[PDB]
């Protein structure tokens, strides 16, 4: 086959909690009463050096943290979601209205974005033979991070 030039991709989540938005320095918050009353919970995942026009199977787990490590997974989330035609933007996961999130304890945001199709050559044939798959796995992300508080 002719030239091909394999795709390298990075993805980034930040997590929304009902009006809270977690940043580079401090997680989302919500009251105890948000938690008991059903807390909205959407990622946005900004990607790069994707495949312009192809489509991704996102995968999204939200995790229970304890001692900086994922410990449970709570909910996940699914879509599959075309990158823009530059290879860089960004996507909404929309995880739903979750229940049972307990006060005083923090959950994570995991992102998995796989081609539908094969992107990546493994084995320098020039064939693309395995989807392309950025993570973002972070256990201590504070973007991605939702703290339950008092
Ligand atoms: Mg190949």
Same mark, same amino acid.
């Given at each position: 086959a002719?030239?091909?030039?394999?795709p390298?991709?990075?993805?980034?989540?930040?997590?929304?909690?009902?009006?809270?938005?977690?940043?580079?320095?401090?997680?989302?918050?919500?009251?105890?009463?948000e938690?008991?009353? =059903?807390?909205?919970?959407? @990622?946005?995942?900004?990607?790069? %050096? #994707?495949?312009?026009?192809k489509? !991704?199977? /996102?995968?999204? +787990?939200?995790?229970l943290?304890?001692?900086?490590?994922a410990?449970?997974?709570?909910?996940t989330?699914?879509?599959?979601?075309?990158?823009?035609?530059?290879?860089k =933007?960004?996507?909404?996961? @929309?995880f739903?209205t979750?229940? %049972? #999130?307990?006060?005083g304890?923090? !959950?994570? /945001?995991?992102? +998995?974005?796989?081609?539908?199709?094969?992107l990546?050559?493994?084995?320098?044939?020039?064939?693309?033979?395995?989807?392309?798959?950025?993570?973002?796995?972070?256990?201590?992300?504070?973007?991605?991070?939702?703290?339950?508080?008092?």
């Amino acid at each position: 086959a002719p030239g091909y030039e394999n795709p390298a991709g990075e993805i980034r989540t930040t997590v929304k909690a009902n009006s809270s938005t977690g940043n580079e320095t401090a997680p989302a918050q919500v009251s105890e009463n948000e938690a008991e009353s =059903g807390v909205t919970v959407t @990622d946005t995942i900004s990607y790069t %050096g #994707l495949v312009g026009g192809k489509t !991704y199977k /996102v995968t999204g +787990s939200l995790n229970l943290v304890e001692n900086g490590k994922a410990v449970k997974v709570v909910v996940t989330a699914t879509a599959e979601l075309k990158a823009d035609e530059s290879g860089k =933007g960004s996507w909404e996961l @929309d995880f739903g209205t979750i229940a %049972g #999130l307990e006060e005083g304890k923090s !959950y994570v /945001v995991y992102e +998995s974005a796989r081609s539908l199709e094969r992107l990546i050559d493994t084995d320098y044939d020039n064939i693309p033979d395995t989807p392309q798959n950025p993570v973002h796995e972070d256990p201590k992300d504070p973007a991605q991070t939702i703290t339950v508080v008092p």
